[PDB]
Amino acid sequence: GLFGAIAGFIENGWEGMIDGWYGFRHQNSEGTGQAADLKSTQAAIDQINGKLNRVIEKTNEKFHQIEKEFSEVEGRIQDLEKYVEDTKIDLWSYNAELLVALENQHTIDLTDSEMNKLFEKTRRQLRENAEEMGNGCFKIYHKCDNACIESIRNGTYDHDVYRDEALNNRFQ
Amino acid sequence: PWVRGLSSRISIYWTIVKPGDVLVINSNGNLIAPRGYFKMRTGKSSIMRSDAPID
Ligand SMILES: *[C@@H]1O[C@H](CO)[C@@H](O[C@@H]2O[C@H](CO)[C@@H](O[C@@H]3O[C@H](CO)[C@@H](O)[C@H](O)[C@@H]3O)[C@H](O)[C@H]2NC(C)=O)[C@H](O)[C@H]1NC(C)=O
Ligand SMILES: *[C@@H]1O[C@H](CO)[C@@H](O[C@@H]2O[C@H](CO)[C@@H](O)[C@H](O)[C@H]2NC(C)=O)[C@H](O)[C@H]1NC(C)=O
User: Which domain of life is it from (chain B)?
Assistant: First the structure.
């Protein structure tokens, strides 16, 4: 979309992430695993919720509606009755087809933002100890265990502890 | 044209009487008198032309 993470710099999507909408996949000294990031999978679902809910309540309740089908030819009063309704109809149909088209474009772009948002949340945590490869993947520049991967994902990473370890791997 | 034996017709009219107004019927032939009045509520009631069974 606009932000160009999804269907963009992130090649494609994980058909085998089944506990969330956004997340991480590691390869470290201890092996290979994956986790959903919840906070973001919530805020993306929480707007769509509101949005849907907003689109819905709304139901035309009035008032002794005029006759709409006709069993004679009557010329003018009828000719108007039909054209009043015929016209109304075309309006709502447009009114509708715009809404869905609008909403979606946005639903699509907000879900895109949420990804790029989670990309930049990570980047800032790993202050100096990694570098963006551009396929939505970092290359951390130190040794990091399952306990350190899971420490990144739950907000509690400590750039300074693996700082010195990080810079030697990058530059020398 | 012939319909149920007859080729005569009746033509049906209405008249609303407001509260405080007065009806006065006057004729010298061919009247189909009313017998009284229907009450006139007014609210969300209406009619539809269906053929689907009520359930
Ligand atoms: C003026 O002419 C009209 C016809 O153009 C006459 O109306 C016709 O009246 C005759 C005589 O009663 C009707 O015959 C009937 O036929 C039905 C058929 O189903 C039958 O049930 C009866 O046994 C009866 O014989 C006929 O229906 C009717 N024609 C039309 C087209 O409505 C009328 O009588 C004439 N009036 C005068 C004052 O001359
Ligand atoms: C978030 O998850 C981390 C990563 O596993 C948790 O790490 C524990 O943290 C304490 C010190 O804060 C240590 O005793 C252990 O290294 C970890 N324990 C276990 C069982 O893994 C931690 O619970 C969470 N972070 C914070 C700051 O509470």
Answer: Viruses
Report how far residue A163's alpha carbon sits from residue A143's, in angstroms, rounded to the nearest whole number.
Answer: 12
Report the number of distinct structural domains present in chain A.
1
Residue A77 domain boundaries: 1-172
Rounded to the nearest 5°, which phi and psi values hold at A25? -130, 120
Distance from CA of A43 to the nearest CA of B (A): 44
The CATH number given to whatever domain includes residue A26 is: 3.90.20.10
> Is residue A34 within 8 Å of residue A24, measured between CB atoms?
yes
Atom index in ligand 2 nearest the CA of residue A150 equals 4
- For residue A86, the tally of other CB atoms under 10 A from its CB is 10
3-state secondary structure chain A: CCCCCECCCECCCCCCCCCCCCEEEEEECCEEEEEECHHHHHHHHHHHHHHHHHHHCCCCCCCCCCCCCCCCCCCHHHHHHHHHHHHHHHHHHHHHHHHHHHHHHHHHHHHHHHHHHHHHHHHHHCCCCEEECCCCCEEECCCCCHHHHHHHHCCCCCCCCCHHHHHHHHHC
Resolution (A): 3.4
Helices A38-56 & A76-125 angle (0-180, nearest 10) = 170
Find chain A residues with C-beta within 8 A of B44's C-beta: 63-64
Task: Report helix, strand or coil for B16.
Answer: coil
